[PDB]
Amino acid sequence: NITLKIIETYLGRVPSVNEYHMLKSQARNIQKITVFNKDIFVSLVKKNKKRFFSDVNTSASEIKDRILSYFSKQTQTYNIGKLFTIIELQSVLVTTYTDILGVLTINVTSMEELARDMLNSMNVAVVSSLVKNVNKLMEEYLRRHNKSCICYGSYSLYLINPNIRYGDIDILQTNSRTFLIDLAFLIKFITGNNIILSKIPYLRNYMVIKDENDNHIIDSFNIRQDTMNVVPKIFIDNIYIVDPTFQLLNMIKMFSQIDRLEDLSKDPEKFNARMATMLEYVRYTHGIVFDGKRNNMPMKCIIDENNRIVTVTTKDYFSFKKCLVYLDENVLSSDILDLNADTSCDFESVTNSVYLIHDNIMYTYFSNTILLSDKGKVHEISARGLCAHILLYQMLTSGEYKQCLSDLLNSMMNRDKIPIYSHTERDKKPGRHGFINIEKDIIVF
Amino acid sequence: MDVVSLDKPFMYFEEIDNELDYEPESKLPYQGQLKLLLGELFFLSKLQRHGILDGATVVYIGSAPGTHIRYLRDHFYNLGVIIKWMLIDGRHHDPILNGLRDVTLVTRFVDEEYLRSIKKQLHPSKIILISDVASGNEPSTADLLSNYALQNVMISILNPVASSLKWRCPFPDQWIKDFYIPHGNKMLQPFAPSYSAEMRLLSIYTGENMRLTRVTKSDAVNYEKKMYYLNKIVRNKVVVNFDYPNQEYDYFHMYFMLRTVYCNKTFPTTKAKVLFLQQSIFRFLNIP
Numbered sequence: 023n024i025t026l027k028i029i030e031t032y033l034g035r036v037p038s039v040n041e042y043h044m045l046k047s048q049a050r051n052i053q054k055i056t057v058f059n060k061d062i063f064v065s066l067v068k069k070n071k072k073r074f075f076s077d078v079n080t081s082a083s084e085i086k087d088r089i090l091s092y093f094s095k096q097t098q099t100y101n102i103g104k105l106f107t108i109i110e111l112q113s114v115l116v117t118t119y120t121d122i123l124g125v126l127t128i129n130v131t132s133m134e135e136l137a138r139d140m141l142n143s144m145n146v147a148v149v150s151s152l153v154k155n156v157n158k159l160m161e162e163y164l165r166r167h168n169k170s171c172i173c174y175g176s177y178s179l180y181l182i183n184p185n186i187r188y189g190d191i192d193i194l195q196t197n198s199r200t201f202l203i204d205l206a207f208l209i210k211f212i213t214g215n216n217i218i219l220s221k222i223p224y225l226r227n228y229m230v231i232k233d234e235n236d237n238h239i240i241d242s243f244n245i246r247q248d249t250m251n252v253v254p255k256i257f258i259d260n261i262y263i264v265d266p267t268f269q270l271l272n273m274i275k276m277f278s279q280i281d282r283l284e285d286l287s288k289d290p291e292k293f294n295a296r297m298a299t300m301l302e303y304v305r306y307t308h309g310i311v312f313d314g315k316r317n318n319m320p321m322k323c324i325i326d327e328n329n330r331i332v333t334v335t336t337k338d339y340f341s342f343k344k345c346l347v348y349l350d351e352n353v354l355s356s357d358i359l360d361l362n363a364d365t366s367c368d369f370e371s372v373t374n375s376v377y378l379i380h381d382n383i384m385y386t387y388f389s390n391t392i393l394l395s396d397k398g399k400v401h402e403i404s405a406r407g408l409c410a411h412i413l414l415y416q417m418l419t420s421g422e423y424k425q426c427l428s429d430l431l432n433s434m435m436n437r438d439k440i441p442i443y444s445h446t447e448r449d450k451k452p453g454r455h456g457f458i459n460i461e462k463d464i465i466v467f
Numbered sequence: 468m469d470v471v472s473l474d475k476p477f478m479y480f481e482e483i484d485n486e487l488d489y490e491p492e493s494k495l496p497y498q499g500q501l502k503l504l505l506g507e508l509f510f511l512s513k514l515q516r517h518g519i520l521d522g523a524t525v526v527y528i529g530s531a532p533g534t535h536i537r538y539l540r541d542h543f544y545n546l547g548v549i550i551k552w553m554l555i556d557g558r559h560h561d562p563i564l565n566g567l568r569d570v571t572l573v574t575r576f577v578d579e580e581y582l583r584s585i586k587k588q589l590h591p592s593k594i595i596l597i598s599d600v601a602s603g604n605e606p607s608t609a610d611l612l613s614n615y616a617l618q619n620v621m622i623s624i625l626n627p628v629a630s631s632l633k634w635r636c637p638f639p640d641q642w643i644k645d646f647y648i649p650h651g652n653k654m655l656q657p658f659a660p661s662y663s664a665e666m667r668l669l670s671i672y673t674g675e676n677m678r679l680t681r682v683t684k685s686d687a688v689n690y691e692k693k694m695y696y697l698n699k700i701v702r703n704k705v706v707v708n709f710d711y712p713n714q715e716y717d718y719f720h721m722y723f724m725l726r727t728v729y730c731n732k733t734f735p736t737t738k739a740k741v742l743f744l745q746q747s748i749f750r751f752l753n754i755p
């Protein structure tokens with residue numbers, strides 16, 4: 023009974039048989055939408071526009087119409103699928119906008135030489151202005167959501183060393199989708215331009231907001247509370263950043279990816295600054311001494327090219343004899359199931375792989391290309407990457423890693439460039455390119 | 468008396484380390500929904516853990532009425548896992564599955580033609596298949612074989628990254644001929660009927676290699692004996708070293724399944740988490 027009156031008011035007409043049946047169950051969320059005060063919202067969006075998008079020339083009247091138009095576009099939509107979409111998106115705003123965007127309105131230069139030395143030895147290969155605005159908004163965001171949003175990459179290092187230049191702000195969140203939907207709407211309302219949210223298959227729990235012209239605006243990686251709780255973090259300027267120690271470890275694993283080394287050669291200077299900043303931090307923070315001395319590091323890595331598995335002899339540094347590193351995640355997943363192992367530690371995009379210790383053998387997957395110095399021989403750059411990949415696990419589990427990290431860095435010193443003979447390809451990751459198209463009332467995953 | 472202590476319950480058929488000759492002479496409300504809920508929650512959680520659930524389309528064949536599926540759907544939805552559910556059955560599903568943008572309800576009996584149709588439609592979506600197809604007493608061996616032939620057809624056409632298939636080996640004394648099934652782990656099911664020999668074959672596919680293994684009458688003898696031992700001896704025991712409100716084997720088994728499930732609420736101990744999940748599940752299924 024009351025359901026019909028809810029639906030009729032929402033649709034601004036009398037529900038057809040089919041419509042009352044289809045929307046019947048959403049009666050609750052629909053009422054929340056109708057009851058929501060649309061005036062305070064217009065006020066909120068405007069207030070936001072002045073603090074973060076003053077340079078956007080649009081009428082407060084222009085904003086109002088866009089908004090009120092959206093909260094009534096059900097009254098003009100008859101396709102049930104489109105209706106389900108509008109109700110879903112509207113609810114996200116009604117239930118989360120205030121908490122998410124609403125709240126928003128109230129020693130290095132010494133290590134530079136060491137950095138060059140390390141990087142040069144590895145050098146052996148061969149976007150809308152809305153970002154300026156969004157960037158400044160994220161600066162505040164990181165401060166009001168310390169528990170659900172953490173930063174890494176350039177910006178996080180810039181907070182340590184103001185000399186660092188950053189193009190965007192990299193973040194991990196426990197609520198990416200809600201956040202991205204809220205932000206997409208905010209931009210839509212202020213700007214008037216149709217942004218699209220899309221999900222990328224080969225990235226884990228990844229979503230990005232692109233403008234009307236496919237220009238990158240902002241992206242985010244989703245992680246569960248479990249993961250967020252174990253990620254090594256540091257408190258800086260009222261914001262959490264991924265521990266620079268952990269980021270250093272990921273940088274080392276990153277140089278194993280062919281594309282990244284190619285970036286290193288294009289502009290070596292870019293990496294010197296970030297490298298140096300992290301080296302500095304570690305030396306000061308962990309009392310790590312940088313003498314070209316570090317044994318057993320680059321711990322033997324043997325490739326079995328046919329099965330695409332790199333064996334890493336780890337018995338010198340860890341309890342498990344060796345670590346089998348798979349290059350095909352589906353093969354790893356299937357092999358772990360064969361072992362009847364149900365509790366492999368997962369850290370999602372943070373490590374882009376599960377880690378399992380079974381019968382004192384670690385099983386894991388490596389998401390970057392493996393560089394080779396010769397036929398069937400792993401290039402020392404990838405060996406350090408593999409080693410770094412294992413150390414990420416040590417960090418995520420409060421295990422020992424300090425000495426090994428010291429050994430890893432020291433092994434990067436006084437090195438002669440070794441050319442890249444070849445490299446393995448990454449495994450293909452199937453899946454569709456999903457997206458949310460607000461103006462077209464379409465959600466496809 | 469008739470209690471026992473174990474380090475863990477038998478999670479897969481291959482673990483059962485004993486047998487008993489079956490004997491022809493061999494309780495909870497909505498226990499069948501609990502059986503499917505636990506097994507699927509377990510299966511999907513494993514896929515979430517290993518990163519294959521992320522952005523997948525879960526194609527469920529023979530899912531009606533599927534009341535329990537509404538629980539799975541909210542669980543993952545609340546964990547922020549993006550999933551597209553496609554529920555297919557010759558019969559209608561429970562109404563609580565209606566009015567959800569992320570779940571498509573299809574009423575129709577599947578055949579080769581239809582399978583090819585949705586594969587074209589879903590492509591390039593990563594597909595996860597769950598089959599609980601039936602066909603009234605106990606199914607004949609001929610019906611079961613027809614069923615396994617169809618499940619194989621589903622796999623070969625849909626090319627899923629992972630699957631959970633209903634698996635109950637024809638009884639020895641009712642053998643027709645040998646047949647094939649995908650390689651995989653045969654997950655035991657807590658809360659299944661008292662003498663059920665049914666299990667869930669879980670597979671994670673490796674590229675274009677559908678691995679097919681033969682099932683023989685000899686394997687049937689083994690399935691019947693292992694399961695009889697498990698149903699007659701093991702499942703009737705109270706686990707003494709299992710510190711839980713209910714020390715029944717089935718609850719012990721359930722605990723090892725639910726302990727692998729993710730929850731964004733934080734608990735002090737695993738026990739506290741499993742307790743919460745169990746209550747949440749029983750509450751949802753209307754089980755006291």
Ligand SMILES: Nc1ncnc2c1ncn2[C@@H]1O[C@H](COP(=O)(O)OP(=O)(O)OP(O)(O)=S)[C@@H](O)[C@H]1O
Pocket residue numbers: 057058059060061062063064066120121123124125127128
């Ligand atoms: N923009 C809005 N539109 C409709 N209802 C709102 C709006 N903002 C708040 N409410 C209602 O007021 C209550 C919650 O107040 P809050 O959303 O937490 O604070 P707020 O007024 O939005 O503060 P702002 O973000 O400071 S800048 C609920 O009953 C909401 O339904």
Ligand SMILES: Nc1ncnc2c1ncn2[C@@H]1O[C@H](COP(=O)(O)OP(=O)(O)OP(O)(O)=S)[C@@H](O)[C@H]1O
Pocket residue numbers: 174175176177187188189190192269270271272273275276277279282390
């Ligand atoms: N392929 C990868 N493998 C392992 N770690 C990676 C990889 N790609 C990126 N990372 C990690 O994520 C961090 C940030 O990604 P980036 O895009 O390099 O951020 P950024 O360098 O600060 O941004 P700009 O545009 O270059 S200023 C890196 O410093 C690495 O620690």
Ligand SMILES: [Ca+2]
Pocket residue numbers: 175176177189190191192
């Ligand atoms: Ca960056």
Ligand SMILES: [Ca+2]
Pocket residue numbers: 190191192241
């Ligand atoms: Ca970025």
